[PDB]
């Protein structure tokens, strides 16, 4: 109800619009007592269209298509969501 | 920046033999997505680096079956199972797990071979250099093995050491041989004050040196 | 195919400036991060600049911060590196890399206060026997490297040993050997082709018998 | 609470991930008793980060910048539909 | 500098297929929607294919749906128009346009059962004033276009290349050039002409009678 | 699609005069953002179309201040305050407000000018053409105004009309003149049945016809 982002089943996803490398994104989320989204939780829901191409917890971008990559994801920047317990 | 240590600095292996390079990182190269981003690059002289292996053990297209990558955390290995003449260059390991990309110290592969004697040829100073004011006597030593070679210069049966410039080529990718060029440099004046100019090449292929010489006037 | 061509590069006096170009084709420029990588004389590979995918983030190492700037152009797909306050440690062959997968061809940069000198080209003919004649070519007293050398404008390239240049004093020396059969020379005019890019010099010299 | 999208001040923003031209976007929102977002409503709020480059009810894409060598009338973009909630 | 270049386009028989190309540079290919517009012989302008920004959507007019397909190449930055079941009304100069702002030079597409025929080229010199006129007759060729220069481009001032005219499934073109009496026959004036549809590239020197 | 009607089809205006074209859409071109997307393109012959005016009234860079766009809903006007030689071609209005882009019928601008007489020029068949057994005589009439010109072919004194191919060039962009080319094509034998070959041009510039002729025997 007071979640300035995506509220889903007692969880609040806050968008960070600043492009960052996974490491830094993860660090920033942790620094605010939060984690990055999990590829499992968010897929096959409605959050998918908001979080696609943003950092998942595993270090890979969240994707509908887990295809078989000509670019080290560990060398790219992406926007990110930080997740916390709302209720 | 993550530190990459390669072992050894120089590799010297006979054609037909197995070879191995080591690579060590200061951190685990395990990225949180289960993948390990260690790569193996190879660079011939006068050529850009070409990737031979990615993600520890995956081979690039074209890459022969003889190249094998291993290892997990901080320790990695590239095996060339049977060294061939085309394999010469500098091999780097490069990590891509942690920003930024960091490289090893390089490993230069030198190919061993059966001994071969050089084809020595001497050349008098050019007619156009004498016109300018200098004079340089050149001696080519071509297609030999091993790399170690000694060249003595002689002006009138007397050893000269000042003004000599020696350069070896990069090993041949076809027949694995070295070639060397020796240049003796003198003034137009100094050259004309002498007559007998000799080039004396010592190699392990024979006890006797390979002697090439000329006389100034004899032409 | 993926293509990367480096441009710019040349002799620069310590504390000078230089702008390098990386023309890219065969891929959507913006959808890839690109590195600027240099190869030092001791032949180690070093990153000097990073621009992220999308162009959003640009990073540099501490030895290079405050004097290198990575530019971009989405119009022409070209990537630039503007370097200034150039040190002796900045010397080397500069590559742009689209991951460790694809490297450019490199553009040479020399940071020396020694001035550009035009090379001297000398033909090498035998002393006034056998079925194998060896001829040579001498390139003397020039700055800086590199120098292109071919035989018969490129026609003859087998059995040729182009020897790497060596420094004596602010000057380089280079030589090149070529072995043909006795039938070929002097029957067919063998010419040494040599070009110095830095001083815009490109002269040819025919090997004439003694 | 039962807003499958962005909730803000008695309004629910449903993202349409299908790229559409403005005229079609406006239609799909109306066909669901909603409208496209209002620029003033979203600019200077947390929704701007989600809705930039999506259609605004006026026919322009919502942008932080008020620019342009492009004929927006001929382009396609994603869009949100706004139904009032509570 | 934004640049667009059309490609392909030959003579096609009523039913055949043809694939056109629009090569781009000077702008981010994906950032822009691009149209395929054609110009009929009556010289009206018609859209035949639209591809959205980011390539997401493609659209065609009813006259062209089910036979025209627009392709793309994000690597090379090239735009394709694949056409098939070609009607005679599909005939014209085809343009790709990055908005009404930027149009390529265009590419010629002719739909006819009439067979390709190479041009016969004839030099025109006067019979045996202060200024001299010389000409060149391009006769009996199909289809358009043909390219005619004078001294391969060196001489272009005072030229009059006349528009091709159909007579009976064959075109005839003529071109005149004027120089002063001092220029000709003192210097060589050559009539260079090329017909790509038949791979003809013939040069013809103008010699006095 | 949105129907765009231009009026008139052709415009014939003297240099230095005001001109105007109208453009009517079947539907308001007022887009939801307050802007109206009407464009005026100008296409020279042999060239791709170029835009002059966008958003009803705004001029592109370079475009002279002579061109002025107007209109609001379904009714639009392009005014040229003083016609200059270079303005020739077909003007289109095209609407951007509704997908897809749709164009008007076009409005050809034919420049009116002071009178000029044609420089007439006649040409006997080439030696190469006779080889093939067909002969054609070509007559060039260059840089005249107005476009209307009567060309008669006369063989041994009497008019011939069979095998006549005429072509007018598009008005010159600089000097606003037209040029014409008439071609009479015969069989070789038929050409060799006569000797007088006259190209006769009747233009309003002179009361007499411009006669250009040759005799087959004059080489």
TrEMBL record, chain A:
Source domain of life: Viruses
Binding site for Zn(2+): 16, 32
Signal peptide segment: none
Places the protein is found: Host membrane; Virion membrane
Disulfide cross-links: 3-12, 29-82
Record function comment: Forms a complex with OPG162 and OPG190 to coordinate the incorporation of OPG164 into wrapped enveloped virion (EV) membranes and, subsequently, the production of actin tails. Therefore plays an essential role in efficient cell-to-cell spread of viral particles.
Complex formation: Homodimer, disulfide-linked. Interacts with protein OPG190. Interacts (via C-terminus) with protein OPG164. Interacts with OPG162.
Entry's family note: Belongs to the orthopoxvirus OPG161 family.
Protein name: Protein OPG161
Residues shown, of full length: 98 to 185 of 185
């Amino acid at each position: 109800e007071s979640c300035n982002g995506l509220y889903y089943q007692g969880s609040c996803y806050i968008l960070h619009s600043d492009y960052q490398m996974f490491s830094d994104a993860a660090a920033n989320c942790t620094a605010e007592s939060s984690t990055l989204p999990n590829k499992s939780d968010v897929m096959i829901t409605w959050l998918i269209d908001y979080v696609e191409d943003t950092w998942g917890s595993d270090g890979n971008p969240i994707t509908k298509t887990t295809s078989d990559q000509d670019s080290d994801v560990s060398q790219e920047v992406r926007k990110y969501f930080c997740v916390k317990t709302m209720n | 920046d993550v530190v990459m240590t390669q072992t050894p600095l120089t590799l010297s292996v006979t054609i037909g033999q197995p070879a191995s390079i080591s690579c060590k990182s200061s951190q685990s190269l395990l990225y949180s997505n289960g993948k390990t981003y260690l790569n193996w690059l190879l660079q011939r002289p006068g050529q850009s680096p070409k990737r031979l292996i990615y993600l520890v053990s995956k081979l690039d297209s074209g890459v022969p079956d003889r190249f094998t990558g291993s290892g997990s955390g901080t320790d990695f290995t590239l095996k060339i199972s049977r060294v061939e003449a085309e394999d010469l260059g500098i091999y780097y390991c490069v990590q891509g797990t942690h920003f930024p990309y960091t490289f090893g110290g390089g490993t230069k592969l030198e190919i061993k071979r059966a001994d071969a004697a050089p084809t020595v040829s001497i050349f008098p100073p050019s007619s156009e250099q004498l016109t300018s004011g200098g004079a340089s006597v050149v001696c080519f030593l071509n297609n030999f093995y091993p790399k170690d070679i000694n060249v003595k210069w002689k002006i009138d049966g007397s050893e000269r050491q000042n003004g000599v410039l020696n350069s070896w080529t990069d090993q041949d990718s076809k027949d694995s041989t070295y070639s060397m060029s020796s240049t003796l440099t003198l003034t137009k004046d100094e050259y004309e004050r002498h007559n007998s100019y000799t080039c004396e090449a010592t190699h392990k292929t024979s006890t006797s040196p390979i002697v090439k010489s000329f006389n100034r006037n004899e032409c | 195919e993926v293509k990367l061509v480096e441009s710019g590069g040349g002799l620069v006096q310590p504390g000078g400036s230089l702008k390098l170009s990386c023309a890219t084709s065969g891929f959507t420029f913006s959808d890839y991060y690109i590195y600027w990588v240099r190869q030092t004389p001791e032949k180690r590979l070093e990153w000097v600049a990073y621009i992220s995918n999308g162009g959003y983030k640009t990073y540099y190492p501490d030895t290079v911060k405050g004097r290198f700037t990575i530019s971009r152009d989405n119009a022409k797909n070209i990537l630039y590196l503007q370097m200034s306050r150039l040190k002796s440690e900045d010397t080397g062959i500069y590559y742009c890399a689209r991951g460790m997968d694809y490297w450019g061809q490199g553009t040479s940069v020399t940071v020396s206060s020694a001035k550009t000198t035009a090379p001297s080209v000398y033909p090498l003919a035998p002393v006034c026997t056998g079925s194998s004649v060896t001829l040579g070519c001498l390139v003397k007293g020039y700055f800086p490297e590199p120098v292109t050398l071919t035989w018969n404008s490129g026609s003859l390239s087998s059995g040729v040993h182009t020897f790497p240049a060596v420094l004596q004093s602010d000057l380089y020396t280079l030589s090149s050997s070529v072995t043909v059969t006795s039938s070929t020379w002097p029957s067919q005019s063998i010419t040494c082709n040599v070009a110095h890019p830095a001083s815009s010099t490109k002269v040819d010299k025919k090997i004439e018998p003694r």
